[PDB]
Amino acid sequence: LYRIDLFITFTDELITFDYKVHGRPVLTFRIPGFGLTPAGRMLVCMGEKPAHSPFTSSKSLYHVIFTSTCNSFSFTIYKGRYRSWKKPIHDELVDRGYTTFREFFKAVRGYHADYYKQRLIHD
RNA sequence: CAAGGUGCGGUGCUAACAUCCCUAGCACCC
């Protein structure tokens, strides 16, 4: 049983992706921000490419949880942080599995591959 | 029934003991 937590922070200026293993930082990247609806933010969390909206001047956080066994792969998105009491805004379970962390991690990063290409780095 | 988050620069002392991770107070150093 492998698990990765990804926290996505949306502002109009930047969208930040923070990946964690055992809750500690392993990978981060950020891209230029754009205007989004609530629906649009969920689609970004999903790794889709939504239509842009007017700016909102808002800051919001979304919590994406990836887990896998040799039998199944789970993908869950929360508005804000996971809580015992909170319903996910999107939840997917698929009959694919992984038996090494490196391959699991490669699958996880595949969700946002196209956003990774847009990342901003130092020179 | 919606309702925790600066997700973290070191060090020392005292107190306490959130099913990803994260105890509090004071002080010194950076």
Author numbering: 5 to 127
What does the report in the manuscript say about this coordinate set?
The cardioviruses exhibit the highest known viral PRF efficiency in nature, with up to 85 % of ribosomes diverted into the –1 frame. Frameshifting results in the truncation of the viral polypeptide creating a short 2A-2B* fusion protein which down-regulates expression of the viral replicative proteins.
Stem 1 (S1) consists of three Watson-Crick G-C base pairs between highly conserved GGxG and CCC triplet motifs, providing a structural basis to the previous biochemical characterisation. This results in an unusual helical geometry: the first two G-C base pairs (G17-C38 and G18-C37) exhibit a typical helical twist of ∼36.2°, but the final base pair (G20-C36) has a twist of ∼50.6° relative to G18-C37 (**Figure S1c**) causing compression of the major groove. Immediately prior to S1, the 5′ end of the stimulatory RNA also interacts with the surface of 2A, with A15 stacking against W89 (**[Fig fig2]** and **movie S1**). Downstream of S1, loop 1 (L1) is a single nucleotide (C21) leading into stem 2 (S2), a seven base pair A-form RNA helix (C22 – A28; U39 – G45) (**[Fig fig2]** and **movie S1**).
